[PDB]
Structure formats: C-alpha cells, structure tokens
C-alpha cells in the first residue's frame with residue numbers, strides 16, 4: 001500500500017525494486033544495511049485488518065517451522081524477522097528467485113522438461129508433507145507459491161537449477177483450528193462442496209500444479225464454482241454420488257446430478273477446452289505415464305480415498321531420483 005523505490009523501512013531496509021504485488025499488498029527486494037548489505041525480500045502487508053491478522057497467523061506458522069526445521073531441510077521459506085512500519089506489517093524473508101508461474105510466464109508459457117518436473121514434484125511433495133507431519137494444511141498451494149532458489153536460465157529458456165522453496169503461509173491452518181472458507185483456481189472438490197478439508201486438499205493442488213508444469217497452462221482456468229465443477233467432470237469423470245448428496249451447498253445439484261448446461265454457449269466453452277485427463281499426454285513413453293498415474297491418484301475426488309504425500313514420495317515416477 002503506496003510504497004516506492006529508494007525508500008527505507010524501519011531504518012534498516014532499503015527498497016531496491018518490487019518483486020510482485022497481490023491483494024495483501026506487495027513484496028520488495030531490499031538491502032539490509034544492518035546485516036552487511038544482504039539483499040532480502042520484504043513483504044509489506046496492507047493495513048486492512050483482514051490482511052493484518054492473516055499476516056499475524058503467518059508469523060506464528062513461520063516461527064514454528066523455522067524452529068522445527070532451522071536448516072530449511074524441508075524447503076519452506078525462511079523468515080528472518082518482522083516489524084511494523086507506519087501501521088503496516090512487514091515480514092522479512094530470505095531472498096529467492098522467480099516463481100515457477102513467473103518463470104513459465106516469461107518463457108512463452110512453455111512447459112517444463114519432465115526431468116525438471118520430477119525434481120520439482122519431489123521437493124514440493126516432500127516440503128508439504130513436512131507441513132502435513134506438523135498438523136498443518138497449506139490450503140493455498142499454487143505455481144505462484146513455489147519459487148526457484150536460483151532462476152538463472154540458458155537460451156527457449158532452460159532453467160539451470162530447479163531447486164525450489166514453498167512460500168505463502170498466510171492461509172495455513174492447524175488441525176487444532178477452525179476450518180475456514182476463503183477464496184482459488186486449485187480448490188479441491190471437498191472444498192467447493194463445503195464438505196470439510198484438511199491435508200488431502202493440499203494434494204489436490206499439487207496435482208493441478210503438476211499438470212501445469214507439464215502443459216504450460218492450467219486446466220481449471222475459471223474463478224467460477226460451477227464452471228470448475230463441470231471442468232472437473234470432463235477431465236476426471238463423474239462426481240461420486242454420495243458427495244453430491246451430503247453437500248450443504250446443494251444449490252447446483254439437481255436430481256442428484258450436476259445442474260450444468262452442456263447445451264449452453266458457456267457449456268461449449270467448457271467442452272471446447274477440456275478433455276479427459278489422460279488425453280493431455282504428449283508422449284506415451286513410460287515415464288510420462290508414471291507421472292500421469294501419480295497425477296490421477298492425486299486428483300482422486302474422494303479426499304478420504306486420496307493418495308497421501310507420505311505415499312506420493314514412494315511412487316515409481318520418482319524412482320530415477322533414487
């Protein structure tokens with residue numbers, strides 16, 4: 001909320017540029033003048049209470065992981081400190097590279113080479129499973145929350161070092177806590193249908209993330225609940241009967257079916273740009289297919305019967321990493 005370059009925060013950090021913006025506010029690269037000049041990333045949070053207590057939660061999550069895993073072994077972003085600055089909350093992070101979304105974005109939305117996807121997939125899975133081990137759900141996993149450590153590339157840009165870290169913990173919730181409904185192009189189905197969530201909804205996102213690394217685009221491109229539900233079914237097949245029945249938000253559930261118009265102009269938009277999952281493959285080579293096996297397991301409709309990351313890390317697709 002209106003900052004600028006060359007500025008100084010809390011008499012220590014000097015803004016050099018802006019790494020990105022969001023509804024919460026922004027992230028800037030600074031020079032830390034009281035730590036020898038190290039570049040760091042600083043998250044300045046708009047002074048709206050909604051974002052202010054998200055930030056406060058985030059700080060306690062970040063402090064938990066940071067003490068439990070001070071080595072960043074499990075690759076969750078490291079918080080260096082926080083402060084207040086004219087009513088704005090500021091969180092200081094280790095400085096990292098581009099988002100995976102941003103990197104793809106500036107590469108013509110070319111996808112990642114499968115061997116890079118594998119190492120990325122492994123680290124995300126391993127990192128979030130850590131959160132999962134500690135009674136935490138991220139709820140907000142997306143390609144934009146996964147950043148390369150160094151995002152240098154050769155060039156059709158080829159990424160040098162696919163090492164990543166997992167970042168935004170504003171939304172992360174403990175099991176010991178009340179389970180929200182916030183708002184998003186990667187929400188699990190047990191989330192849209194207001195049926196309760198927990199660790200298995202992180203796994204859903206990871207599936208969606210891995211389709212995107214593979215194709216270079218998303219396959220659930222709509223911030224509309226109905227459109228999404230229909231996309232889900234064209235790609236993954238029929239929604240389980242029981243979930244449709246035991247849903248509080250039983251608005252678009254007519255005669256126990258999805259009350260969507262396959263016949264409407266908007267319907268054709270859903271059909272014209274979505275096919276069954278396995279039709280998205282671009283090779284039928286063995287390792288392409290191990291991957292889609294994993295993705296299909298991750299995209300199981302029933303969170304109760306959905307693969308866990310503890311399992312996912314043992315899947316065939318990762319064998320070459322061993």
Ligand SMILES: O=C(O)c1ccc2c(c1)nc(Nc1cccc(Cl)c1)c1ccncc12
Pocket residue numbers: 019020021022025026027041043077093094095096097099147167168169
């Ligand atoms: O939320 C965090 O924990 C969080 C923590 C660290 C970074 C971050 C978000 N976002 C960066 N980039 C970014 C890119 C686009 C939009 C926005 Cl808002 C931010 C970034 C860059 C370099 N080093 C650390 C970070």
